[PDB]
RNA sequence: CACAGGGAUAACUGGCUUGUGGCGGCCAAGCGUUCAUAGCGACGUCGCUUUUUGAUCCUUCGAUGUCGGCUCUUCCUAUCAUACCGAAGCAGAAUUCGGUAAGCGUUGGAUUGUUCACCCACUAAUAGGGAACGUGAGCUGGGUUUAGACCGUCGUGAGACAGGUUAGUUUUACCCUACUGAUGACCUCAUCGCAAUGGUAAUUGAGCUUAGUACGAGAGGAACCGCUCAUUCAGAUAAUUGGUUUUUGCGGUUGUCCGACCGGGCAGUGCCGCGACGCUACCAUCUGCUGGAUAAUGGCUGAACGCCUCUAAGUCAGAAUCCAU
RNA sequence: AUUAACGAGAUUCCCACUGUCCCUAUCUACUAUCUAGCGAAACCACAGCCAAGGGAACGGGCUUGGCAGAAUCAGCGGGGAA
RNA sequence: ACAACCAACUUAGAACUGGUACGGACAGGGGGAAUCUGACUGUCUAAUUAAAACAUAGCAU
RNA sequence: UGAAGCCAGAGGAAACUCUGGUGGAGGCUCGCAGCGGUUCUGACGUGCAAAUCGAUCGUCAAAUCUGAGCAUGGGGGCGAA
């Protein structure tokens, strides 16, 4: 047992919840919910999404 | 073959008639076989469905693929405030079945019991059991003593009249659900003294059931109203070209017999049926006073079983609870009957001794990611509040 | 001897009925796998046979070397886009559906697998696990 | 194309019959390494069924909607598979014949309107039938089965063709019963119970071990117990995932309109992304017990019939069978 | 006999696409539904529970059995050879 | 090959910009390889058949 | 979309051939109204209607559509049949 981090938004992923996506390039992505999964599949940039962990780190918040 | 390609029948003939149950509280149709060697003990209890949640535990099943790995599985939480015992019923065995010989009521019945005997309690005079309490008082309660002697001498099956404490649950109802629980155990004399001593004394779910016990849960399922054939029986939907409706059975019978038969699927009532779901393993019997009901030996967070924001459409849990594996019939807030198993268990799965590892307490009102308000504040830092 | 079924496979979401086309994830020369049937399927009216990761199927090659075109080969599914969960409670899915041409005994016809391989495929078939790279 | 009629008379069901179709017996010439009867059984011969087609014309001509397919229920046994057994030209494995037994199953496709057939593939198995050749106020209309049209043969011609093509309106339930659910008067109201009767539900396979062991000269090659799963079916549930969006919840955006761009109206929900609750999917999760009486069969004691032998009196075990929980 | 272009003509295949289908689920509007008002028609020997028998050879009535308890509402499409 | 005063549309080029979205609603061809048949446009069985049927130009008597 | 006719340039010994414009022909083409009526064998089918309604569809500069006046009258008329 362990917790993971959403690769798009940095949210904590407790066991059972969320989804795991294996890109054909052998990459591994973890999503806490469908909101982050949809944005990832729409090839949005996590750094331009204002509620993500990466955005708050770039903008010093 | 005259049925060109044949398939198994849609639905079960063993659950007819599929009509609204004649009751709202699940009924124990049969009690266990009552071995006379075991000590006296109750065999049933009543609780209220609070909701579902998920857990993680280390499986233990030699030969299985996940023999020592962690498995995620759903559980159901049943709120069980302690029950009060207010009566004693004796049954005699007759060539026509079992017959209730006499009933003994303890004095000082609470208003929760007394409301069960009225439809308009608000404007009544509340005269229930007002002249009965004189039996306990007059002649040093000789009338009650005679009835107790009758039960010991004649009756072969003894049951207590149970009582819920719905005032301790977050439900708007004030009527308590009354029940008969059979005292399986020793001799008839032992059963009467066991039941008599339990008068007006609360009985906790701790004594009736253990942690690793396999139980049966009895409740009335979720109502769906008048529903069609495809929903009730799961028949194949008709092609989209059909003129007068698609969700129907095409042939409802042959020419002969010249009748519509009882084995043909027809639209009507679905749900709200009485069901007895069996072989449910208990995972935890939590305490209502403990502040760490959801805390395990691995997750040492002092968190209670109530998810963040409370159980959806139920509320919080401030009483004892039973954590049972899997799903059970009924809806939230529904009174549910827990009964001891009538079978003998020899499977390793049934005999397995469970030990929890983590209990989810994230909100069920959404995609909750935090298990406690403290964890939410450290992750999110400070807000404008 | 015996029939080509994964004898020990746990239940999983299938998401690949017959008539589906998988990418060929090995160097056998094929580029498609047309699923014509699944091994171990029972019998129920109108229900199409379906398989998931690690299930052996019979397939035909719609695109590839002419030596593999007009024949029926036993294949094994190693990827699928339909999400499925293991006993650990996590829901996993890949980018596309893929499979590898094998023989009746289970040995792979090719020698190298392109892309990730689902865990169930590796456990059930020793030769797929040997020739696979990243497995998750 | 029309009228008066006909069930005095055909085409579809039903009724009698069973040649024909199908199925089952008796005898024993032969086949089977020798050996009629393990398995077959010619020449003969006795039957049964009404799932084939005939024969007939009893009912219907002031009409019983006339093929098939889809859907759904139930019944039969002449048992394909599964349970338990007997026999073999049964060493093992595989297979063949037979007994109880219809409890439970008997598939996905290419071609054809097809029944049928023939292949591919899976499967424990892909058994055979009935219910007005079950089922058109259940569907469809592919065929058949009006009127249009084409071709070939036939006819001088109009026209004919179980010869071939293409296009061709499928009506009504609100009545009674039947079924599915839902109320309900009389015996004061209410709570807690009993249980007559009715229904009843489970199914099958694969891995590990047994074990490369028993068996067998090699090749080959089991099963009982015990676990672990999965197929079909059944009941339930909404923690997770997936679906659904009038939460018209928030955000984005197009064209107009409100006079200064905030906030809104309209485009029958303008469109797009996310979307909680609720509902919901072997697209998700959980669960599905055990007595007793037997059938075939193998036995015990034991006469009839001083010997014997499962039966005659008595009696034991025993099937997915019957009854009950 | 062959034909470019054309065809709400008939036929076969391939790509894309999709609830046709595996296997169904959910949402909206208007009905159905309940109420106030208004208010028909087809049809109708008499009526309306079965099993078997016989009978003009497929009965609601006959015979022998099974049985059988007021009054009703919403659906339904087996029967009334409707 | 100039200077001054007017004019309303069309086209082209470049920075910047945005959750890479932009014919953002509306409006708005699915395509290909063939076979049979009629050349094509046109016409008819109002109220079950729009067709390969009729017609047509051309040819012939 | 772009036929005749017309303008300019280029190539060639010549015959003549190319390129860019202009022009606006066709029982041409996409498509709105009108006209029609292919499919859903959709709705309705004691209907709104003794033939209508919805989507989809055919044609859309002409062998297109159409009003009024007039002619043809029953073994007769009229008929792209
Ligand atoms: Mg049939
Ligand atoms: Mg229709
Ligand atoms: Mg005849
Ligand atoms: Mg015969
Ligand atoms: Mg006749
Ligand atoms: Mg006659
Ligand atoms: Mg007639
Ligand atoms: Mg008649
Ligand atoms: Mg009829
Ligand atoms: Mg038999
Ligand atoms: Mg017949
Ligand atoms: Mg009918
Ligand atoms: Mg015709
Ligand atoms: Mg001739
Ligand atoms: Mg004829
Ligand atoms: Mg019973
Ligand atoms: Mg369900
Ligand atoms: Mg969701
Ligand atoms: Mg949801
Ligand atoms: Mg003896
Ligand atoms: Mg009768
Ligand atoms: Mg009658
Ligand atoms: Mg009489
Ligand atoms: Mg009578
Ligand atoms: Mg009827
Ligand atoms: Mg109806
Ligand atoms: Mg017409
Ligand atoms: Mg027409
Ligand atoms: Mg012509
Ligand atoms: Mg138009
Ligand atoms: Mg129309
Ligand atoms: Mg229609
Ligand atoms: Mg109607
Ligand atoms: Mg004019």
3-class DSSP assignment, residue B112: helix
Q: In whole angstroms, how far apart are CA C35 and each of B198, B365, C100, C108? A: 68, 42, 12, 17
Longest alpha-carbon distance in chain B: 82
Nearest-CA neighbor of B234 among B255, B205, B263, B265?
B265
Phi/psi at B268 (nearest 5 deg)?
A: 170, -140
Tell me how crowded residue B53 is: count the other CB atoms within 10 A of its CB: 20
CA distance B217 to B281: 10
Task: Report whether B369 contacts A12 (CB < 8 A).
Answer: yes
User: Using alpha carbons only, how large is chain B's radius of gyration in Å?
Assistant: 25
Q: Where are the beta strands (DSSP E) in B24-136?
A: 41-42, 44-58, 70-79, 83-84, 87-94, 97-105
Task: Report whether B48 contacts B79 (CB < 8 A).
Answer: yes
Mark residues 275-304 of chain B whose C-beta is closer than 7 A to nucleic acid strand E. Answer: none
CA distance B191 to B169: 30
Q: In units of Å, what resolution does this entry have?
A: 2.7
User: Of all nucleotides in the shown strands, which has a C1' nearest the CA of B261?
Assistant: D179
How far away, in angstroms, is B244 Cα from ligand 33 center? Answer: 10
Task: Report whether B128 contacts B117 (CB < 8 A).
Answer: yes
Q: In whole angstroms, how far apart are CA B39 and each of B84, B151, B200, B339, B343? A: 21, 19, 21, 17, 19
Mark residues 332-361 of chain B whose C-beta is closer than 7 A to nucleic acid strand D. Answer: 332, 343-344, 346-349, 360
Angle (CA) B308-B314-B316 rounded to 5° is 50
Task: Report whether A47 contacts A54 (CB < 8 A).
Answer: yes
CA distance B84 to B199: 8
CA distance B321 to B117: 28
Q: Is the dihedral of CA B253, B257, B260, B265 positive or negative?
A: negative
| Bridge partner residues of A7 (DSSP) | none
Contacts of B270 (CB under 8 A, 6+ apart): B18, B224, B225, B227, B231, B232
Tell me how crowded residue C79 is: count the other CB atoms within 10 A of its CB: 25
Q: Is the dihedral of CA A40, A45, A47, A49 positive or negative?
A: negative
Angle (CA) C43-C45-C10 rounded to 5° is 45
Contacts of C77 (CB under 8 A, 6+ apart): C16, C22, C51, C52, C53, C54, C55, C57, C97, C98, C99, C121
CA distance B330 to B338: 13
Contacts of B47 (CB under 8 A, 6+ apart): B78, B79, B80, B205, B321, B322, B335, B336, B338
* Helix H or strand E encompassing B150: helix B142-154
| Phi-psi label, residue B366: left if phi above 0, alpha if psi -120 to 50, beta otherwise | left
Task: Fill in the DSSP letter of residue A25.
Answer: T
B356-359 and B268-269: which strand pairing?
unpaired
* Chain C residues closer than 8 Å to B6 by CB: 45
PDB experimental method: cryo-EM
**And the tokens for A26?**
């052998």
Phi/psi at B137 (nearest 5 deg)?
A: -90, -55
CA of B298 to C1' of F6 (A): 89
CA distance B298 to C52: 35
User: Using alpha carbons only, how large is chain C's radius of gyration in Å?
Assistant: 14
Task: Report whether B19 contacts B242 (CB < 8 A).
Answer: no
Q: For chain C, which chains pass the contact test of at least 3 CB pairs under 8 Å?
A: A, B
Q: In whole angstroms, how far apart are CA B61 and each of B31, C55, C87, C91? A: 31, 25, 13, 23
Indicate yes or no: strand D within 7 A of the C-beta of C66: no
CA distance C50 to B207: 49
B127 burial class (0-12, 13-18, 19+ CB within 10 angstroms)?
A: exposed
* Chain B residues closer than 8 Å to C122 by CB: none
The alpha-carbon gap from B72 to the nearest alpha carbon of chain A, in Å, equals 6
């Amino acid at each position: 047992m362990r917790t993971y981090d959403d690769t798009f938004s940095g949210q904590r992923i407790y066991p059972g919840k969320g989804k795991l996506y294996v890109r054909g390039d052998s990459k591994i992505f973890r999503f806490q919910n469908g909101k982050s999964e949809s944005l990832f599949l729409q090839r949005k940039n996590p750094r331009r999404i204002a509620w993500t962990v990466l955005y708050r780190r770039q903008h010093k918040k | 073959s005259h049925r060109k390609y044949e398939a198994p029948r849609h639905g079960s003939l063993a659950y007819l008639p599929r009509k609204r149950a004649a009751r709202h509280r699940g009924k124990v149709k049969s009690f266990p076989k009552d071995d006379a060697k075991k000590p006296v003990h109750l065999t049933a209890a009543m609780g209220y469905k609070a909701g579902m949640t998920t857990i993680v535990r280390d499986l233990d099943r030699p030969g299985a693929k996940a023999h020592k790995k962690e498995v995620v599985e759903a559980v159901t939480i049943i709120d069980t405030p302690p029950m009060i015992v207010v009566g004693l019923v004796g049954y005699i065995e007759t060539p026509r079945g079992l017959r209730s010989l006499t009933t003994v009521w303890a004095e000082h019945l609470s208003d929760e019991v007394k409301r069960r005997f009225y439809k308009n309690w608000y404007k009544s005079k509340k005269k229930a059991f007002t002249k009965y309490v004189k039996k306990h008082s007059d002649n040093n309660g000789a009338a009650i003593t005679r009835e107790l002697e009758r039960i010991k001498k004649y009756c072969t099956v003894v049951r207590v009249l149970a009582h819920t404490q719905i005032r301790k649950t977050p439900l708007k109802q004030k009527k308590a659900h009354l029940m008969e629980i059979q005292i399986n155990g020793g001799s008839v004399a032992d059963k009467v003294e066991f039941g008599h001593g339990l008068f007006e004394k609360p009985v906790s779910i701790d004594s009736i059931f253990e942690k690793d016990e396999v139980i049966d849960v009895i409740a009335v399922t979720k109502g769906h109203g008048f529903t069609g054939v495809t929903a009730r029986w799961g028949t194949k939907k008709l092609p989209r070209k059909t003129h007068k409706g698609l969700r129907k059975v095409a042939c409802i019978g042959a020419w002969h017999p010249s009748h519509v038969q009882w084995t043909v699927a027809r639209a009507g009532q679905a749900g709200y049926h009485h069901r007895t779901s069996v072989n449910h393993k208990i995972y935890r019997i939590g305490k209502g006073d403990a502040e760490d009901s959801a805390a395990t030996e691995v997750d040492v967070t002092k968190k209670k079983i109530t998810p963040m924001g409370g159980f959806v459409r139920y509320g919080e849990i401030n009483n004892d609870f039973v954590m049972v594996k899997g799903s059970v019939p009924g809806v939230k807030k529904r009174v549910m009957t827990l009964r001891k198993s009538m079978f003998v268990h020899t499977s390793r799965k049934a005999l397995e001794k469970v030990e929890l590892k983590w209990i989810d307490t994230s909100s069920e009102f959404g995609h909750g990611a935090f298990q406690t308000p403290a964890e939410k504040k450290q992750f999110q830092g400070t807000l404008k509040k | 001897q015996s029939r080509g079924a994964p004898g020990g496979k746990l239940k999983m979401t299938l998401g690949l009925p017959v008539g589906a086309i998988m990418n060929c994830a090995d160097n056998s020369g094929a580029r498609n796998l047309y699923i014509i049937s699944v091994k171990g399927i029972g019998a129920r009216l109108n229900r199409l046979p379906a398989g998931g990761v690690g299930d052996m199927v019979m397939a035909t090659v719609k695109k590839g070397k002419p030596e593999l075109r007009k024949k029926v080969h036993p294949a094994v599914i190693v990827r699928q886009s339909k999400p499925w969960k293991r006993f650990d409670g996590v829901f996993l899915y890949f980018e596309d559906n893929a499979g590898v041409i094998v023989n009746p005994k289970g040995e792979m016809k090719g020698s190298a697998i392109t892309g990730p391989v689902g865990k169930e495929a590796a456990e059930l078939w020793p030769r797929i696990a040997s020739n696979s790279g990243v497995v998750m």
